[PDB]
Structure formats: C-alpha cells, structure tokens
Amino acid sequence: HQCGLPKLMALELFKPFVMKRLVDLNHAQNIKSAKRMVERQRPQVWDVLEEVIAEHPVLLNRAPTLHRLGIQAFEPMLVEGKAIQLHPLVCEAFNADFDGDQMAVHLPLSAEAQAEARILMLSSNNILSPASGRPLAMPRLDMVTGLYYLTTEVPGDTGEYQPASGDHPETGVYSSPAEAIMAADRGVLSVRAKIKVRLTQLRPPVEIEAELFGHSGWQPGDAWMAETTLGRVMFNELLPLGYPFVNKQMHKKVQAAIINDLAERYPMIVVAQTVDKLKDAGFYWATRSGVTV
C-alpha cells in the first residue's frame, strides 16, 4: 500500500498543506512567509511535510493506461533521491519495467477524492485482474525463484532424515522448527533436506488432520509430526495462520493456486499481507538461490 516519494517532489505536491501546517505552528509568522520558507526548503519543513504526508494517498500512473489498474493509489513516504520507488508486486499491473520508464503522481484534494483513493483505487485493495479474476500482485521473477529454491527437496542433502538402522535412532528429527533453524546455522542441516519436524503452530493437511485429529479440528499449540524440508516450513509460516500445510515444491502455478484460494476464502487485507511476506522471502532466498549465467 506504500510508495516512495522523492522529498522535493512531495514538498512541491503538498506545498499548500505544508504551508498551512507551518503557520499553525510558529515556524512561519504568516502564510506568505510560509510560502517563502517552503520555496527555500528551510529545514523546518521536513517534520511538517512528513506529518501532512501521513495517510494522505497519492495516485500513480504509467502510460499507456490499458486498464484501470494503470492508475493506483498508494500511501507516500519520504524517500531519498529523485526517483519514485514502486512496489515490485504492482509492476505486472502497470507493465512497469525499470529501463527508464517514468510515472506520474496526482494528489487528491477533496475529502471525496481522498476517500475514493483510499477505498476504490488503493493498491492492496486491488490484487486481482478485473478481467480474468486471477491474481496480479502475485509473485513473479526473482520472488518465484526464491520460493522455488526454498521449497525444493534435495535427496542426500546435509542433515537428511535417516531410517535409524543399526545401533542409533533417527537422526533427522527435530522437536521444533526453531531447533531445525539452529541446526541450519551450523553446517548440520540444509534448508532443502528432507526431515521430520514437530509442528505446534501450523495446520496439517486435510488427510493428516482428519486422521490424527478426527472430528475435532486442529488447534494452535497441538503438535504433529511432519515430513518435509525446513524451507517448506518457513514457506508455510508465510501463509495465514490456520492455512492447511502445503508440502510441495512451489512452482509459479502452485503459488497462483494458493493465492487464488486465499482471494476466495480470505479477506483482502490478509491476502495483501501474505503477498508481502512472500515478497520478502522470495527476494531474500532469490539472492541465495545461486542462479547465475
């Protein structure tokens, strides 16, 4: 729901609001001197600017506008530099490549215009294609790669679960996912290795939940033994609490199916936070996926 706004750009766009709030406080004697101070970029204007910016939406547009998602409303935040910072999930909607593409900002003034921006045109309020209903703000490119690297199962990977043949018991089992993270901090466990973890905080799939927990549904805190990789646990923790565990290598199609399902059965804000969590994880693991030419 946010966009980076260059400081000087925001100061010019919001100039009257910054002047009014500048005369409310005693920084400016009157409104004309306030204009003189904003034009000169006196240091007093940055606190006030950050104040008036708050929860005041702006509209971003990239030409050509093919469909209404070509214009979207964001909450601006003061950012360093002269470039507008755009969220990676809306690029698909804007067809925004960063080759030098430019975008336009518009400041809604009246209470009705601001309300329409916050409600009708807000970025996180439109996740889905108005045409096909499929998710747009869905992950793509590096993000996909990261998640795909995270949820892949590598046979023979470090710390792989072992049958416990011979004189020793099972070496691939962990009491909690936190313990598995501790093992991965040392060289002992690979994020992509097949293991067994006891999960309290994640919902089991349909078959395992009906078999183990019977008629009574699963509840947070109830432990169950899962056979997966630690990466798939970290991925499922990005999904909403109480979502049935998905043990799969995450292709783009699988992520699109999960987000399609969340759009149908879940509130819009839940989806909007889920795709952001998937974003951070997908990028972080994209840099560590080793993809190179």
């Binding site: 360093e80 002269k82 960063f98």
Partner: protein, 336 residues
Amino acid sequence: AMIPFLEHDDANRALMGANMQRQAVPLVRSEAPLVGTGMELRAAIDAGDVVVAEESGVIEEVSADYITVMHDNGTRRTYRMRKFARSNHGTCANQCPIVDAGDRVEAGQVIADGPCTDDGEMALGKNLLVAIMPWEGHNYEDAIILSNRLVEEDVLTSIHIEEHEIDARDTKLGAEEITRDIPNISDEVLADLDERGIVRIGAEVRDGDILVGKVTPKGETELTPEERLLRAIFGEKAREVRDTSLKVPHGESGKVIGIRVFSREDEDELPAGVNELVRVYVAQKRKISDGDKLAGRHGNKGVIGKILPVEDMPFLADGTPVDIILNTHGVPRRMN
C-alpha cells in the same frame, strides 16, 4: 562494429546497443574499454572531436590551452583546445593533450583526447566489476545496483552545461531594463550580481537564484490597492516595474562558467525591439544517481534502483567490493 561478441547477440538487442552507444554521455574522465572490437580508434579519429597532428614533428610547447608542434620544415602548427564547451545537447566537450614537451609525433597521430576518448580510442563508459546475481530485490526487473564508490570516486560523473538566455526589449509600456536594482529584493540575494545585475563568473547558483536582473514597465492599473496607497502617500516614482529577472529553473545547480552580453549601444546586431541580450552558462557536475539509466553495448540496460554503501556490496575473498550487480533473470531471455 563496436559491439563485442556481436554475433552472440540477437538482432533486436544489438540494435538497442548500437543506438545506446550514441546516447552515452561524456564522463569527466574517459576510460577506454578493456574489451573492444578495434573500431574504437578509427571511430574517434574520423569523428573529428579528437585533435590529430596534421604534420610530423616535435612538440615545441604544450599547455592545457594549446599544443604547438615544430615541423622538420621549421614551420609551426598550434592546435587550440576546446575547453569545457557546451555541445548541442548540453554535454561537455573538453579536449586534453595526451602529448608531452619533448615528444615526437607523426602525421595522423592523436595529439589530444576529446570527449569520450582515451589515448585516441572512443571511450563511452567505464570498466566495472560486475556480479551476475539477484540481490535483495533491488535489481529486480532490469533495475541495476551500484557501489557508492562510483559516486565517491566520480567514475560515472559527467559535466552538463546549460545556456540561459534573456533579453531586454521594447514593450507596450516602454523599454525593459537589465539592472541590479530590483524592487522588493534584499541586498543578500543580490550579492552574487555585478553592477549590471548579471551573475558573476564563478558564482554558485541554485534553484530560484537570480542570473540576470531585469525589470519590465508596469501599468498603474496593475498596482495592488496597497501599492497605490504607498505610491500616492510617498509620491513615489512614476516608473512602475515588475521583476522579470532571469532565475535558475527548478532542480538546477551549478557554477557560472561564462557570460556573454550584447547591446544596442555597441554595433551588436540584435532583432528589432531588443535592446540588450545576455547569455549565462551554468556547468553542473552530475554524480550518478538513483534513476539514471545505464547500458552495456549488448542492449542490456536499466535504471539504477539502489546505490549501496561500499560495505554492503558483495565482495571477493580478497575484500574487493563489486561495482555493479546485474540481475541474473535479465540475461537469458533477451538473447544477448
């Protein structure tokens, strides 16, 4: 012919590369590429912006201003250097001698580097230590990540010279005047103006500053009621003026490197009605910034999306930080 491994690039991306070489801006210091095709030298020479020795001889004297070569005939030839000249598009054309005093040169040899030339070869850019990899979504979607070294050591820095022009002409209410006396204007902001009202060579000008002071005749019906109250109370001057002074546009900074002034009082030819014409040249040192566009010769291009501190960059085992991080996903599908 200047695209290395052209045969390994698809025709569309090679087209973009050929077109973007013509869009490269001259850097404050030029560096020839480690990997060339060999076309660079003849390209720079035939282009003409390099200074070439017409006849063989010995350099008699060399300065930043000129080179003079003593031919074996006893004849002399002196080549004057274009210094910080503004091109049609505002890039900085700056020639520098590559020869020393005792040097012997031959006909055809390059005496001085021009814009985008290193030792005679076309140099349109810098050799940068590159790492092909995704980095934290900052190079996502053709975006490019740079090391702050490129800012601190000025390796991508360029000079851009803007020509500001203003004239004083005849109007309905009579002639305009270029003057230092501008109503409602403090002595503090007139400090960098000379006695004519023109900014002084070497002044640092910023957004909104006065370059050339100018006043235009105003009518008495255009005074505010308060202004007319003052004029009638104090019996002020019959000449009422508006401040039309030439000011620096928004988002511009630099130093004044030149001033040219034309007047009717001299023999200077001016269009009818125009009494005085003054041009101010402002040079800006532009360090590479978020939003600037970079490209390679193969059609790969993007805008800088992040400039990281040197300590944030991935570094080799010996501690050398990479200069630039290009996203892996960009390479294979563009077919370069």
